[PDB]
Amino acid sequence: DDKTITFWHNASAGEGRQYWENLAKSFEEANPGTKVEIQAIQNEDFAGKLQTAMQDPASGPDVFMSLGGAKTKEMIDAGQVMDLTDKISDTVKTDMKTTLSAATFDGKVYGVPVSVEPGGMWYSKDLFKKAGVSDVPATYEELLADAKKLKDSGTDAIALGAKDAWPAAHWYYWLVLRECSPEVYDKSVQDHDFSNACWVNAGKKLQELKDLKVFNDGFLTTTAQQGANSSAGLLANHKAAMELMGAWEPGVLKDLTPDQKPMADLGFFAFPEVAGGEGEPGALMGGVTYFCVNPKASQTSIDFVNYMGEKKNQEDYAKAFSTIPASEPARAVVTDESLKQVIEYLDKAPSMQLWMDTALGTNIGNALNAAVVNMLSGQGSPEDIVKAMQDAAQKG
């Protein structure tokens, strides 16, 4: 049928999963005859399922979460994502002014944003006091020192979901962004040129952290967002003192604490400055979640994504996901102190880089994440991380 639309998101459980049920329901009420069939897919499975399904756009989902950056671009150039420039509502155009750029390719708009999620450090303020850290580290070396203190207090300083590859890679990404100059960074990413010394230097800085042995012991088998022993789970239950992550973090943590209530002592702090690096200080990096429409889809799918962008639904999104909504007016309803700081950093950044693996695409992103994990497991070098990107870059 025609007024029936398949819809894929990655809110696996909890309020987030329920939020989408609720949205579908009240969408169905406002557009009679329409039925929304939902698939809630866990994040690490999502790319695979989306790309298998979209080989046949006719038999794929009508509305789906985007993979972001070059990965969205890869779908556009395959004709798996419909052009929404002349279709997004005026409410979206007005309210998602700053966030729509993440969804814009070749001047054309390809999705509706629901959230913006910068990265940084999320930490236990309680575990920090117990170890003797009264102030958050403004530099990398201070951070590595704070990890030593935290280890001595007999807690795992850093939770790391290395089994999922990307969470470990985020350390690398952040180091490269601080080490490389904005122009070398911007050119490297866009040209797939990884020859500059800032790319090896960053890995060296990451190997330093590795040598400190300050991760949770099972980091190699630790996932990011699955279970109590996932890296968010370790942070949520005060088994580790900090994690490097996107601003989806409070909502994730909230679903992994004993009472499924927000992490009482949660704090945020920007990824520190790095001595000798030439990156624009306080450079932001992060994500923008948005929803794409199947090129082979009907008007009902268009009205659905526009529905997402309406202020009330975005405010509800913010509460359900404990995140920053895309809609600037809906950001009013944000109360979490850590998320407040993140908005402060957001409202004064000159730019935000997308996640590096997202920016570089599937081949280069995957080869990069694996390589970083390999070095961390003592089967790779900072030089090998570079090698790997270069080798995969050959394919395009």
Ligand X SMILES: O[C@@H]1[C@@H](O)[C@H](O[C@@H]2CO[C@@H](O[C@@H]3CO[C@@H](O[C@@H]4CO[C@@H](O)[C@H](O)[C@H]4O)[C@H](O)[C@H]3O)[C@H](O)[C@H]2O)OC[C@H]1O
Binding site for ligand X (CB under 6 A): 10-17, 43, 166, 225, 246, 248, 251-252, 254-255, 287, 289, 320-322, 355, 357-358
Among 340, 359, 305, 346, smallest CA distance to 116 is for 346
Q: Which of 170, 201, 167 is nearest to 271 (CA)?
A: 170
Cβ-contact 196, 83 below 8 angstroms: no
3-state helix, strand and coil shares in percent for the chain, rounded to the nearest 5: 50, 15, 35
* Shortest Cβ 278–ligand X spacing (Å): 23
Q: 220: burial class by Cβ within 10 Å (0-12, 13-18, 19+)?
A: middle
| 128/171 with CB nearer ligand X | 171
Q: Where are the beta strands (DSSP E) in 250-283?
A: 266-269
Least Cβ distance, residue 16 to ligand X (angstroms) = 2
Instruction: Write down the least CB distance from residue 275 to ligand X, Å.
Output: 26
Q: Which is nearer to ligand X, 40 or 349 (CB)?
A: 40
Q: Of the two residues 16 and 34, which places its CB atom closer to ligand X in the complex?
A: 16
In the bound complex, what is the minimum distance in angstroms from residue 320's beta carbon to ligand X?
Answer: 6
Contacts 24+ apart (CB under 8 A), 357-360: 357/166, 357/169, 357/173, 358/67, 358/68, 358/69, 358/70, 358/71, 358/287, 359/69, 359/70, 359/189, 360/69, 360/70, 360/189, 360/192, 360/389
* Angle, CA 294 vertex, CA 298 and CA 319 arms, to 5°: 95
In the complex, minimum distance from the CB of residue 259 to ligand X, in angstroms, rounded to a whole number:
14
| Closer CB to ligand X, 251 or 309, in the complex | 251
The residues near 29 (Cβ < 8 Å, ≥ 6 apart) are: none
Residue (234 or 252) nearer to ligand X, CB: 252
Whichever of 11 and 144 has its CB closer to ligand X, that residue is 11
Rounded to whole angstroms, the Cα distance separating 253 from 237 reads: 9
Task: Please give the structure tokens belonging to residue 316.
Answer: 């509800």
Q: Which is nearer to ligand X, 247 or 274 (CB)?
A: 247
In the complex, minimum distance from the CB of residue 33 to ligand X, in angstroms, rounded to a whole number: 28
Q: Locate tokens 């330093």: which residue?
A: 208
In the bound complex, which residue of the shown chain has the CB atom lying closest to ligand X? 16
Q: How far is the CB of 116 from ligand X (least distance, A)?
A: 11
Q: What is the DSSP letter of 374?
A: H
Nearer Cβ to ligand X, position 179 or 243? 243
The least CB distance from residue 287 to ligand X, in Å, is 5
- What's the Rg (C-alpha) of the chain? 21
DSSP class per residue in 63-83:
EEE---HHHHHHHHTTT-S--
Nearest distance, CB of residue 261 and ligand X, angstroms: 11
Residue with smaller CB distance to ligand X, 118 or 131: 118
